[PDB]
Amino acid sequence: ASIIDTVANLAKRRGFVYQSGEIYGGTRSAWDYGPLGVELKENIKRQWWKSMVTAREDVVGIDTSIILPREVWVASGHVDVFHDPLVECLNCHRRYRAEVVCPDCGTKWTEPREFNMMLKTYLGPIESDEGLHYLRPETAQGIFTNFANVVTTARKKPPFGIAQTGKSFRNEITPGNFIFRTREFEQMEMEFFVEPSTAKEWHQYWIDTRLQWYVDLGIDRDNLRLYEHPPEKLSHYAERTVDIEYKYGFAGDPWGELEGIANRTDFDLSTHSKHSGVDLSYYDQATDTRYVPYVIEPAAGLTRSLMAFLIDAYSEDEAPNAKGGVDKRTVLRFDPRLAPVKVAVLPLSRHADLSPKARDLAAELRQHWNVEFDDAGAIGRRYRRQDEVGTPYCVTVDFDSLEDNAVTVRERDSMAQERISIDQVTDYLAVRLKGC
Amino acid sequence: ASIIDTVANLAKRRGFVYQSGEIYGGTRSAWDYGPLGVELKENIKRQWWKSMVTAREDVVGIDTSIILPREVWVASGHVDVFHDNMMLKTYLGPIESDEGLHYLRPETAQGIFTNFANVVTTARKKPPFGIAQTGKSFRNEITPGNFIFRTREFEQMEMEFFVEPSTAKEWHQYWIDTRLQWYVDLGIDRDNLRLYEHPPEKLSHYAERTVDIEYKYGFAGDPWGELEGIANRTDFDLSTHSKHSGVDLSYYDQATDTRYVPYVIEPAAGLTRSLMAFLIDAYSEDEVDKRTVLRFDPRLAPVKVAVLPLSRHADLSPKARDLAAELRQHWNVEFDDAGAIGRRYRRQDEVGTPYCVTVDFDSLEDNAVTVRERDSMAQERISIDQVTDYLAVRLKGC
Ligand SMILES: NCC(=O)NS(=O)(=O)OC[C@H]1O[C@@H](n2cnc3c(N)ncnc32)[C@H](O)[C@@H]1O
Ligand SMILES: NCC(=O)NS(=O)(=O)OC[C@H]1O[C@@H](n2cnc3c(N)ncnc32)[C@H](O)[C@@H]1O
Ligand SMILES: [Cl-]
Ligand SMILES: [Cl-]
Ligand code: NA
Ligand code: NA
Ligand SMILES: [Zn+2]
């Protein structure tokens, strides 16, 4: 039994993900994120925004509409170029994306039809070509069309970036393994505008910087690699593209795309200047020169990053048992900043004298962190339940706590325990959790 | 010139909002949020999530797809009743036909209801308890509203609170009062908030009683508008999805050997509509010398601290940038060395920054800075190695 399936099964059982519309028949192309999944996803998003926007003078944020004017995607080239070769089996009429045999009926086909990957919708009463709009296949175009607006209000000057997170939509012909490839997914994209002659050096800077970002948040460097797009795989907007790939563990090739980092040269600002008639070039007053910035674009996938962090954090080891034995303990070794639950408050038993001190403590901690309270069953089994979802620290309230006003604090990975006065537990965890 | 127009112009000039696709012709039915706008919007969302989910034992979170199976909106009654049809269509898969027809969600609630049983299982929850969610919804609004008030694409913050039916009415009043207090706690003048009971004609097809929180936006004519809806949806939603799907979404109370379909109390807020309310409410003018100030609660202000070197100098600028870097570990910070310092104070007051930190020549001798509070303009001198802690207690959130 593989590790991807094991992790996917853990995620479903503990409510990281549910298949969207399960009760009506669900598919792998649409997932919901449950109580633990939504916190993990938001924590990843928050760390991306802190690294990209909050911590950097040279990067500012934006949030643009999923639905832009139709002309946007004409100018961008997506209307004409964002399609795949699509053929239909003359026997069953199932569709697939490229002699040859059918993977469902076994037979050896129609002429390849170009199928645009963008999702359509209609705005206004007339359901016609006039009101046709596309759901955005990328968040980048909302940034480019606001480049001049941001330069103005933010008083920014190249080299500088504009970062954004949001939903994107693609009419994927097939679903992926687990949450890897969905029709609706969240992206974290930053467009870094630079003076053209520096573009290549800035490209290497961001490849390295994004790579280090995953390592800093706990992914084993050995499970990350770089992949340079060959000229055929390059997107119509790119001159050079390097993907960060993670060892997901698929059957066959265990590697898959995690984040794409493209040199989009001056393509995007140029075509929007032409089609819109609005000048999106930059004027460098320090040299009395005008130029169209080149763009370096780190474009990450939030849900695909969640899958990578989840798989990388999965682990199994041997841990002291209730009896003097050892067990195959399941542990998600999340960075404390990503863990969906920061602290578990665990009264030794459901005894009525432990509950007052314990519930009061969980309330104090909920002021700062997402907290779980569990008084059900044996304590060691509740420790395993928290380790299984990656909780960094468990706080146990026992009967000695009523006499000395102190609790036990258990560290997830080492399982070491230390006794801490209650009036210092908040500070004790704050330094070890490194974020709220 | 009205306050809405004045506020909207400030929002545009300082980059809180831009009209989406401005360069290709934009309308008020779609807006982008600029550097300051996205921070304010995220701060409101985060404060909503903290009050609803993180701080409450009895409420957990979820995030569900914008595009659900078509059957969801048949069962919910939106296909048949949601017209004045207001739902946006899209087509999934190669065959572009009714076979692949799906609807973009007009509300986020249905993603919660269809997962009710899933959440009870994995989260081990029992009524009374809630499930909260933030995300984009879509409606084919016939006309746009004033500024960002009514758009075809907007963010909602909805929580579905499942209760034993006999307690539903008491829980309805609890959440009306609780939600009202949430806006007050974050700085909105209570006098600009009121309650409105839907008459039977205005009731939605899923609701038995609905109370709206309204804000005095300042529109021409009737200055009040809907801010947040709070509905008693009884057992309508879980009942209809159990029927159409054949999956039992009722709750079995082991403690009483009774099975029932919970009633639902739903506080459903609009993220973008709250931003408009917070933005207007905070706008103010005072002193002569007149001054424009956004009196944001420090937790919502998009920029927490501005670092302001008195002048350009090889000894002041490094100390100032080093300080701005230390503060960027915790908060969104602006660094501004352009122009006279009083001009830079006004620039920050105009977007609601709670605190300005000035680095002057005395800072080189005593390693201390001046900290100016936005509203009072009072100044206090603080050692550099205590500025972070000094600001942390006054910002009340990071
Ligand atoms: N702006 C430049 C760009 O778009 N670039 S990229 O087209 O390569 O998508 C950027 C990232 O979005 C993620 N991603 C893309 N498509 C999907 C999908 N269908 N499901 C899940 N994640 C996806 C993935 O992580 C990918 O690396
Ligand atoms: N689930 C129950 C429900 O949906 N109820 S409600 O339909 O009333 O929308 C809930 C909230 O979403 C916000 N909202 C609604 N429509 C819009 C719009 N077009 N633009 C901006 N905000 C809007 C607004 O704040 C409203 O109170
Ligand atoms: Cl975090
Ligand atoms: Cl209006
Ligand atoms: Na920044
Ligand atoms: Na909670
Ligand atoms: Zn076939």
XYZ file of N, CA and C in Angstrom, chain A residues 107-255:
447
model
N -9.783 -0.049 -28.454
C -10.048 0.030 -29.883
C -9.182 1.130 -30.480
N -8.735 0.904 -31.712
C -7.910 1.872 -32.425
C -8.644 2.422 -33.644
N -10.875 6.689 -34.062
C -10.447 7.976 -33.520
C -10.785 9.123 -34.467
N -11.330 10.199 -33.909
C -11.685 11.369 -34.695
C -10.467 12.271 -34.881
N -10.613 13.255 -35.763
C -9.555 14.232 -35.954
C -9.384 15.070 -34.688
N -8.156 15.467 -34.356
C -7.931 16.205 -33.106
C -8.567 17.585 -33.165
N -9.515 17.827 -32.267
C -10.156 19.126 -32.131
C -9.466 19.920 -31.031
N -9.210 21.196 -31.305
C -8.668 22.096 -30.297
C -9.780 22.505 -29.337
N -9.570 22.259 -28.047
C -10.551 22.560 -27.011
C -9.950 23.560 -26.038
N -10.564 24.733 -25.941
C -10.074 25.745 -25.020
C -10.347 25.324 -23.582
N -9.335 25.496 -22.733
C -9.372 25.021 -21.357
C -10.089 25.976 -20.414
N -10.513 27.142 -20.893
C -11.121 28.140 -20.027
C -12.604 27.858 -19.845
N -13.094 28.108 -18.634
C -14.505 27.953 -18.328
C -15.252 29.224 -18.698
N -16.422 29.051 -19.295
C -17.254 30.156 -19.738
C -18.381 30.416 -18.748
N -18.864 31.653 -18.768
C -20.087 32.030 -18.078
C -20.705 33.191 -18.844
N -21.945 33.519 -18.493
C -22.694 34.565 -19.175
C -23.247 35.536 -18.145
N -22.968 36.821 -18.344
C -23.374 37.874 -17.427
C -24.452 38.723 -18.085
N -25.466 39.089 -17.304
C -26.579 39.852 -17.812
C -27.702 38.956 -18.294
N -28.798 39.563 -18.756
C -29.978 38.771 -19.138
C -29.782 37.993 -20.427
N -29.324 38.672 -21.475
C -29.039 38.014 -22.742
C -27.931 36.992 -22.536
N -28.270 35.710 -22.665
C -27.282 34.634 -22.610
C -26.770 34.478 -24.036
N -25.771 35.285 -24.377
C -25.312 35.408 -25.750
C -23.807 35.646 -25.745
N -23.227 35.715 -26.945
C -21.798 35.987 -27.062
C -21.416 37.355 -26.507
N -22.356 38.302 -26.465
C -22.041 39.627 -25.939
C -21.696 39.566 -24.457
N -22.480 38.830 -23.679
C -22.254 38.692 -22.260
C -21.360 37.538 -21.875
N -20.664 36.931 -22.833
C -19.765 35.830 -22.520
C -18.532 36.350 -21.792
N -18.230 35.743 -20.647
C -16.998 35.994 -19.920
C -16.349 34.660 -19.581
N -15.054 34.713 -19.295
C -14.294 33.537 -18.905
C -13.944 33.632 -17.428
N -14.069 32.519 -16.716
C -13.422 32.425 -15.418
C -11.916 32.384 -15.641
N -11.178 33.112 -14.817
C -9.759 33.288 -15.084
C -9.039 31.945 -14.976
N -8.209 31.574 -15.961
C -7.343 30.396 -15.785
C -6.091 30.679 -14.976
N -5.744 31.949 -14.782
C -4.628 32.341 -13.937
C -4.988 33.666 -13.283
N -4.350 33.947 -12.151
C -4.564 35.214 -11.468
C -3.665 36.324 -12.001
N -2.731 36.000 -12.900
C -1.701 36.959 -13.290
C -2.284 38.154 -14.034
N -3.302 37.933 -14.869
C -3.797 39.018 -15.712
C -4.440 40.129 -14.889
N -5.013 39.802 -13.730
C -5.527 40.847 -12.861
C -4.430 41.732 -12.306
N -3.222 41.184 -12.161
C -2.083 41.980 -11.721
C -1.611 42.896 -12.844
N -1.378 42.329 -14.028
C -0.829 43.108 -15.131
C -1.704 44.312 -15.451
N -3.022 44.107 -15.525
C -3.915 45.200 -15.891
C -3.941 46.308 -14.843
N -3.452 46.045 -13.631
C -3.364 47.058 -12.586
C -1.938 47.551 -12.358
N -0.993 47.189 -13.230
C 0.400 47.567 -13.010
C 0.548 49.075 -12.855
N -0.010 49.845 -13.791
C 0.119 51.298 -13.708
C -0.605 51.846 -12.484
N -1.772 51.284 -12.159
C -2.501 51.722 -10.975
C -1.673 51.532 -9.711
N -0.961 50.410 -9.612
C -0.203 50.115 -8.402
C 1.044 50.989 -8.327
N 1.763 51.121 -9.442
C 2.893 52.046 -9.493
C 2.488 53.407 -8.945
N 1.296 53.878 -9.316
C 0.840 55.195 -8.885
C 0.549 55.222 -7.384
N -0.412 54.410 -6.928
C -0.860 54.518 -5.542
C 0.193 54.015 -4.564
N 0.973 53.015 -4.954
C 1.973 52.447 -4.064
C 3.334 53.118 -4.187
N 3.500 54.053 -5.122
C 4.782 54.718 -5.346
C 5.907 53.694 -5.443
N 5.735 52.730 -6.335
C 6.708 51.665 -6.501
C 7.425 51.829 -7.832
N 8.616 51.239 -7.905
C 9.484 51.396 -9.046
C 10.235 50.087 -9.219
N 10.358 49.573 -10.440
C 11.100 48.325 -10.642
C 12.502 48.435 -10.075
N 13.034 47.357 -9.478
C 12.439 46.021 -9.319
C 11.420 45.948 -8.189
N 10.184 45.537 -8.473
C 9.185 45.375 -7.426
C 8.120 44.404 -7.910
N 7.412 43.819 -6.952
C 6.432 42.805 -7.263
C 5.031 43.106 -6.776
N 4.073 42.366 -7.323
C 2.669 42.441 -6.941
C 2.199 41.008 -6.751
N 1.773 40.681 -5.535
C 1.466 39.313 -5.148
C -0.030 39.155 -4.904
N -0.516 37.930 -5.097
C -1.949 37.677 -5.069
C -2.217 36.197 -4.831
N -3.267 35.911 -4.067
C -3.808 34.567 -3.926
C -5.276 34.593 -4.332
N -5.745 33.500 -4.920
C -7.129 33.439 -5.348
C -7.401 32.193 -6.157
N -8.691 31.995 -6.439
C -9.161 30.826 -7.175
C -8.921 30.972 -8.674
N -8.469 29.887 -9.300
C -8.385 29.782 -10.749
C -9.176 28.567 -11.221
N -9.457 28.530 -12.523
C -10.387 27.556 -13.084
C -9.874 27.065 -14.428
N -9.830 25.747 -14.602
C -9.392 25.139 -15.851
C -10.233 23.902 -16.124
N -10.651 23.748 -17.381
C -11.513 22.636 -17.780
C -10.650 21.394 -18.007
N -10.052 20.923 -16.915
C -9.174 19.763 -16.984
C -9.919 18.554 -17.537
N -9.330 17.923 -18.555
C -9.981 16.802 -19.223
C -10.139 15.630 -18.264
N -9.161 15.427 -17.387
C -9.173 14.338 -16.426
C -8.830 14.856 -15.039
N -9.292 14.180 -13.994
C -8.864 14.529 -12.639
C -7.473 13.969 -12.381
N -6.907 14.360 -11.242
C -5.594 13.915 -10.846
C -5.650 12.974 -9.656
N -4.467 12.527 -9.255
C -4.344 11.780 -8.015
C -4.679 12.703 -6.849
N -5.726 12.362 -6.106
C -6.104 13.093 -4.894
C -6.417 14.536 -5.285
N -5.795 15.536 -4.665
C -6.119 16.935 -4.914
C -5.111 17.583 -5.867
N -4.323 16.772 -6.577
C -3.209 17.299 -7.359
C -3.692 18.140 -8.535
N -4.788 17.735 -9.172
C -5.260 18.359 -10.408
C -6.779 18.447 -10.348
N -7.290 19.660 -10.137
C -8.717 19.916 -10.009
C -9.131 20.995 -11.001
N -10.431 21.043 -11.297
C -10.932 22.071 -12.202
C -10.932 23.441 -11.538
N -11.016 23.471 -10.212
C -11.014 24.696 -9.424
C -9.922 24.563 -8.376
N -9.014 25.532 -8.335
C -7.860 25.451 -7.452
C -7.409 26.859 -7.105
N -6.694 26.972 -5.993
C -6.198 28.252 -5.509
C -4.729 28.409 -5.876
N -4.375 29.583 -6.389
C -3.005 29.899 -6.752
C -2.462 30.998 -5.853
N -1.140 31.018 -5.744
C -0.406 32.068 -5.047
C 0.657 32.528 -6.037
N 0.395 33.657 -6.687
C 1.219 34.149 -7.779
C 1.739 35.537 -7.442
N 2.988 35.788 -7.816
C 3.594 37.099 -7.664
C 4.247 37.458 -8.987
N 3.998 38.673 -9.456
C 4.574 39.174 -10.695
C 5.646 40.185 -10.311
N 6.900 39.874 -10.623
C 8.030 40.710 -10.233
C 8.515 41.481 -11.454
N 8.289 42.791 -11.444
C 8.616 43.649 -12.573
C 10.022 44.203 -12.400
N 10.862 44.003 -13.414
C 12.270 44.354 -13.338
C 12.672 45.072 -14.617
N 13.791 45.774 -14.537
C 14.395 46.338 -15.733
C 14.923 45.191 -16.592
N 14.605 45.154 -17.893
C 14.877 43.937 -18.683
C 16.282 43.357 -18.568
N 17.329 44.183 -18.504
C 18.680 43.628 -18.531
C 19.003 42.811 -17.281
N 18.251 42.979 -16.196
C 18.470 42.212 -14.975
C 17.578 40.980 -14.864
N 16.749 40.697 -15.872
C 15.710 39.682 -15.714
C 16.296 38.316 -15.379
N 17.376 37.926 -16.052
C 17.915 36.587 -15.844
C 18.430 36.412 -14.420
N 19.142 37.413 -13.891
C 19.638 37.310 -12.521
C 18.491 37.279 -11.519
N 17.438 38.065 -11.758
C 16.271 38.017 -10.882
C 15.542 36.686 -10.989
N 15.615 36.034 -12.151
C 14.991 34.726 -12.310
C 15.651 33.705 -11.393
N 16.988 33.663 -11.393
C 17.693 32.734 -10.517
C 17.442 33.066 -9.055
N 17.352 34.358 -8.729
C 17.090 34.741 -7.349
C 15.780 34.143 -6.853
N 14.726 34.210 -7.670
C 13.414 33.767 -7.210
C 13.266 32.252 -7.253
N 13.912 31.580 -8.208
C 13.975 30.122 -8.165
C 14.562 29.665 -6.834
N 15.703 30.241 -6.449
C 16.340 29.863 -5.193
C 15.487 30.268 -3.998
N 14.908 31.469 -4.040
C 14.133 31.963 -2.907
C 12.887 31.115 -2.671
N 12.155 30.789 -3.738
C 10.959 29.971 -3.572
C 11.331 28.578 -3.086
N 12.394 28.011 -3.652
C 12.893 26.719 -3.198
C 13.166 26.735 -1.698
N 13.881 27.759 -1.226
C 14.211 27.841 0.194
C 12.961 28.003 1.050
N 11.900 28.589 0.489
C 10.678 28.807 1.256
C 10.044 27.484 1.673
N 10.053 26.490 0.781
C 9.506 25.184 1.133
C 10.374 24.480 2.167
N 11.698 24.610 2.049
C 12.584 23.984 3.022
C 12.401 24.627 4.391
N 12.285 25.959 4.430
C 12.133 26.645 5.708
C 10.865 26.213 6.431
N 9.843 25.789 5.692
C 8.586 25.357 6.288
C 8.503 23.845 6.469
N 9.601 23.120 6.265
C 9.725 21.749 6.733
C 9.890 20.685 5.667
N 9.800 20.996 4.380
C 9.906 19.956 3.361
C 11.361 19.534 3.217
N 11.588 18.223 3.190
C 12.927 17.688 2.985
C 13.470 18.141 1.637
N 14.632 18.797 1.663
C 15.238 19.288 0.432
C 15.423 18.158 -0.575
N 15.659 16.934 -0.095
C 15.877 15.811 -0.998
C 14.630 15.454 -1.799
N 13.449 15.874 -1.349
C 12.208 15.634 -2.073
C 11.830 16.789 -2.991
N 12.756 17.709 -3.256
C 12.525 18.833 -4.152
C 13.584 18.836 -5.243
N 13.173 19.193 -6.457
C 14.108 19.312 -7.564
C 13.604 20.384 -8.519
N 14.488 20.806 -9.419
C 14.165 21.787 -10.441
C 14.044 21.108 -11.797
N 13.122 21.617 -12.610
C 12.865 21.076 -13.939
C 12.699 22.241 -14.898
N 13.529 22.273 -15.935
C 13.495 23.337 -16.927
C 12.564 22.934 -18.063
N 11.568 23.766 -18.338
C 10.665 23.497 -19.448
C 11.441 23.450 -20.761
N 11.267 22.415 -21.578
C 11.793 22.463 -22.942
C 10.959 23.396 -23.799
N 11.423 23.726 -25.004
C 10.705 24.728 -25.807
C 9.279 24.337 -26.154
N 8.966 23.040 -26.219
C 7.599 22.639 -26.547
C 6.645 22.872 -25.379
N 7.077 22.564 -24.154
C 6.210 22.691 -22.987
C 6.032 24.130 -22.521
N 6.862 25.060 -22.989
C 6.749 26.445 -22.552
C 5.371 27.001 -22.887
N 4.813 27.772 -21.957
C 3.538 28.428 -22.193
C 3.715 29.600 -23.156
N 2.608 29.996 -23.788
C 2.672 31.022 -24.824
C 3.158 32.362 -24.289
N 3.139 32.557 -22.973
C 3.538 33.817 -22.366
C 4.975 33.810 -21.860
N 5.688 32.694 -21.983
C 6.962 32.502 -21.309
C 8.094 32.326 -22.309
N 9.274 32.797 -21.917
C 10.509 32.585 -22.662
C 11.384 31.517 -22.018
N 11.409 31.469 -20.688
C 12.086 30.425 -19.932
C 11.245 30.114 -18.701
N 11.075 28.829 -18.398
C 10.302 28.426 -17.229
C 11.008 27.298 -16.495
N 11.101 27.431 -15.174
C 11.654 26.403 -14.303
C 10.579 26.015 -13.297
N 10.271 24.726 -13.227
C 9.321 24.206 -12.254
C 10.063 23.659 -11.045
N 9.519 23.921 -9.867
C 9.872 23.172 -8.670
C 8.976 21.941 -8.616
N 9.586 20.763 -8.510
C 8.848 19.512 -8.433
C 9.085 18.859 -7.077
N 8.064 18.157 -6.590
C 8.119 17.446 -5.321
C 7.920 15.954 -5.558
N 8.591 15.131 -4.746
C 8.447 13.676 -4.836
C 7.148 13.270 -4.143
N 6.044 13.414 -4.882
C 4.731 13.097 -4.332
C 4.589 11.609 -4.034
N 5.194 10.761 -4.856
C 5.062 9.329 -4.707
C 4.073 8.671 -5.642
N 3.747 9.300 -6.768
C 2.859 8.680 -7.737
C 3.413 7.329 -8.175
N 2.516 6.465 -8.640
C 2.943 5.254 -9.327
C 3.525 5.633 -10.682
N 4.708 5.111 -10.985
C 5.384 5.471 -12.213
C 6.436 6.523 -11.947
N 6.187 7.751 -12.400
C 7.052 8.874 -12.073
C 6.576 9.482 -10.761
N 7.336 9.370 -9.667
C 6.857 9.910 -8.385
C 6.906 11.430 -8.289
N 7.472 12.126 -9.273
C 7.618 13.573 -9.224
C 6.482 14.269 -9.969
